[PDB]
Amino acid sequence: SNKERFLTLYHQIKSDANGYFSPEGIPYHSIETLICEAPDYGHMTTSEAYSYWLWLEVLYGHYTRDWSKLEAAWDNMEKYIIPVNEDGNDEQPHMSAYNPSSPATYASEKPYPDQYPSQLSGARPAGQDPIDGELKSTYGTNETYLMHWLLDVDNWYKYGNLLNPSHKAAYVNTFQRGQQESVWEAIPHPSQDDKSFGKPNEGFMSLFTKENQVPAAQWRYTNATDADARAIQAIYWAKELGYNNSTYLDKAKKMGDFLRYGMYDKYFQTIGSGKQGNPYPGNGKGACHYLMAWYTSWGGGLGDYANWSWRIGASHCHQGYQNPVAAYALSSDKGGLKPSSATGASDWEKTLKRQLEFYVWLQSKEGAIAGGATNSWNGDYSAYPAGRSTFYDMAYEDAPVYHDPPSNNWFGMQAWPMERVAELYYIFVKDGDKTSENVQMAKSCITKWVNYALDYIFIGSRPVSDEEGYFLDDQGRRILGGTNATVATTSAPGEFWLPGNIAWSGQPDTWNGFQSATGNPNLTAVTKDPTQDTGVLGSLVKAFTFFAAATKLETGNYTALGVRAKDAAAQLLEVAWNYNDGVGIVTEEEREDYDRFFKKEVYFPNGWNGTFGQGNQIPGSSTIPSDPQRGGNGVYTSFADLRPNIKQDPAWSSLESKYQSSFNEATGKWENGAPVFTYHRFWSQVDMATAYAEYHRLINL
Numbered sequence: 001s002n003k004e005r006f007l008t009l010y011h012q013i014k015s016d017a018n019g020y021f022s023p024e025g026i027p028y029h030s031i032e033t034l035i036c037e038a039p040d041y042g043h044m045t046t047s048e049a050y051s052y053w054l055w056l057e058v059l060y061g062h063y064t065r066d067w068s069k070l071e072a073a074w075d076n077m078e079k080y081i082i083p084v085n086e087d088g089n090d091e092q093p094h095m096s097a098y099n100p101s102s103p104a105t106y107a108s109e110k111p112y113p114d115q116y117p118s119q120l121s122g123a124r125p126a127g128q129d130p131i132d133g134e135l136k137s138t139y140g141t142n143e144t145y146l147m148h149w150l151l152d153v154d155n156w157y158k159y160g161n162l163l164n165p166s167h168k169a170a171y172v173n174t175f176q177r178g179q180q181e182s183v184w185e186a187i188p189h190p191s192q193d194d195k196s197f198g199k200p201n202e203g204f205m206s207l208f209t210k211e212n213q214v215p216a217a218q219w220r221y222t223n224a225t226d227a228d229a230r231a232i233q234a235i236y237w238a239k240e241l242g243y244n245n246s247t248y249l250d251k252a253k254k255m256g257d258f259l260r261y262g263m264y265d266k267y268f269q270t271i272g273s274g275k276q277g278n279p280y281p282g283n284g285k286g287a288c289h290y291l292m293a294w295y296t297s298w299g300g301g302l303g304d305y306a307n308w309s310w311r312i313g314a315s316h317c318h319q320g321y322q323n324p325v326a327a328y329a330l331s332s333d334k335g336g337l338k339p340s341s342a343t344g345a346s347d348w349e350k351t352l353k354r355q356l357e358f359y360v361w362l363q364s365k366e367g368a369i370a371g372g373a374t375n376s377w378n379g380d381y382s383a384y385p386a387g388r389s390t391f392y393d394m395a396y397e398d399a400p401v402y403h404d405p406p407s408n409n410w411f412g413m414q415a416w417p418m419e420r421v422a423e424l425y426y427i428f429v430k431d432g433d434k435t436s437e438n439v440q441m442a443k444s445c446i447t448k449w450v451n452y453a454l455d456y457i458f459i460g461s462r463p464v465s466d467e468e469g470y471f472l473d474d475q476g477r478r479i480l481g482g483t484n485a486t487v488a489t490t491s492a493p494g495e496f497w498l499p500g501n502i503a504w505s506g507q508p509d510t511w512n513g514f515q516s517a518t519g520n521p522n523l524t525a526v527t528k529d530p531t532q533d534t535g536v537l538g539s540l541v542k543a544f545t546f547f548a549a550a551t552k553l554e555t556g557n558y559t560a561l562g563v564r565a566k567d568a569a570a571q572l573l574e575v576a577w578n579y580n581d582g583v584g585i586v587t588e589e590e591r592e593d594y595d596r597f598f599k600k601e602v603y604f605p606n607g608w609n610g611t612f613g614q615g616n617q618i619p620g621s622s623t624i625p626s627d628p629q630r631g632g633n634g635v636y637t638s639f640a641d642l643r644p645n646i647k648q649d650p651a652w653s654s655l656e657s658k659y660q661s662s663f664n665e666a667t668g669k670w671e672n673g674a675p676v677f678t679y680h681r682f683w684s685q686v687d688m689a690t691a692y693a694e695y696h697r698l699i700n701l
């Protein structure tokens, strides 16, 4: 039974014997250590993993009627990854000295990491923060109650935890150098930078910014907007399923209140003001785009001589980070998590609508959801290109935030958000709303999406594909998007296949409202790269499950497509069960990208030497000059040279041997097989567990 499968997997995730959690009760990114993808080591963790943990405990708590584990997980999150410490040392010193009339100092982003550090020029004065005052008034504090995105759970980078030294799990930053800094190209550095590592007198600050004084010791946290929102989404479900401890409900509210910082342009510039390359500061809420941008970041001085702090929003918004279930939870009486601030609920209400419009606007001619938009073209408020489509005066982006790899190519970026739009369709209908613009947008988007996705889901059959990843039809032709895609298949009992990536081209038409939507005939998703990602399966199953369920609440029966989505969910669940290895539902994956452990592509500026967390001098001697075409002048070292303790990993030998014996450094190609791995990712196993659970809850009953 699906209930039983849910409980089984839940116990496999929680078991001390399996190693999904650290000795301190903190979920890791993955049981395995040698992995690199967003976190760059498997025993980092993320705010995403914490949010998934909460989701898992919500469903389990509903089944056992005991909420103690949900509460314990929230306390753990609070203790280790939210940098607010009522009691011990202040984890945001000098946040009180924040100046909401000058939230931060402008610096340009750059098209390559090679062009960093960027000058803190204050070229563009920052606009007004219009929520700081409400938050202070509501909570008696402006300490940001959001999860930092990245935690070094085993202190693998050896920075320690400056402001809470008895905690082994330490706050760490990576990404900080623009769209071309892949996970392989970032330099891990402590969130709390007392300059005891990095360059003497400078810490790591001078990799990223330059200014005319010596950088003070300082701290810097950065959230992920989909993580905190998924925490709130989990608390929404708990409350719907009977949870009602105020102490924790109110903590989710407070989290949603601070998450509003994700709705603001990076430097509080008026939305649209950079369209012609001359931005200007926002007044009131003029810098509020009402979307979740990729992050909000906050920082300040360390020590008695550094009494300042700052905030940034973000200008780039990615469809895959919007969470309109959280927005609903935070904005309506039926959602149940309205904040007590003066405009928290009403800002989230606008956001819910704006997120739904964004999905409709971005939906390709065939039904897939294109990338997003920005208020800062090239991250320096460049004029938008002639003819660029816009959404509320923000420029369309096919790969918001990151380009290596392009951030909306991964099919996971379809499943994740479409799962939540499906949830919201269900929620609206169950709350008695068949008529609002909001349910019509949600429904229209998800109905088209489900149609789209079902062409590339294969259960008990293996799709035919070419050596470049394209799906082929029965005549052997590449299928290059379009509706009614007919993929050729062979019989393959017990296998499943999902799409891996999308190649995007074209643009949506400029947004004019839902009543004028064009169907984006010049926006094309080519779906490719058949794979067996069990994380994506779990997320998809839930999208199909909630969507089916909604169609039956709406109409009394499963609609035509409701039936197909229900059957796809059930079939995926049944085949997936065979891939349980006793620890997780898993499959083997090839990682052709793992030549980037070794490639010399980690940039350091000229004249910069310092000490890495692991003790090694960086950049050190194992370097090549940076590429003049990327506009820097500095050097590259490798991922592996920067992190010498990786050579101590038990899997390191076999990876290096495989690289030696198979990768051709001249052609850039794996000739004799790419490295292969079988990974037990926390988020992925939770997406699987929760898929069995919700099928039982919504379909079995």
Ligand SMILES: OC[C@H]1O[C@@H](O[C@H]2[C@H](O)[C@@H](O)[C@H](O)O[C@@H]2CO)[C@H](O)[C@@H](O)[C@@H]1O
Binding pocket: 037, 038, 039, 048, 410, 412, 533, 535, 536, 681, 684
């Ligand atoms: O960065 C998004 C998401 O990536 C996850 O890893 C994916 C990766 O993007 C894809 O190209 C790869 O080959 O499949 C994996 C596994 O699902 C990663 O697990 C997440 O933390 C991350 O948020």
Ligand SMILES: [Ca+2]
Binding pocket: 078, 079, 080, 081, 082, 083, 084, 085, 091
């Ligand atoms: Ca804390």
Ligand SMILES: [Ca+2]
Binding pocket: 180, 181, 182, 185, 404
């Ligand atoms: Ca790059």
Ligand SMILES: [Ca+2]
Binding pocket: 245, 246, 247, 248
């Ligand atoms: Ca209580």
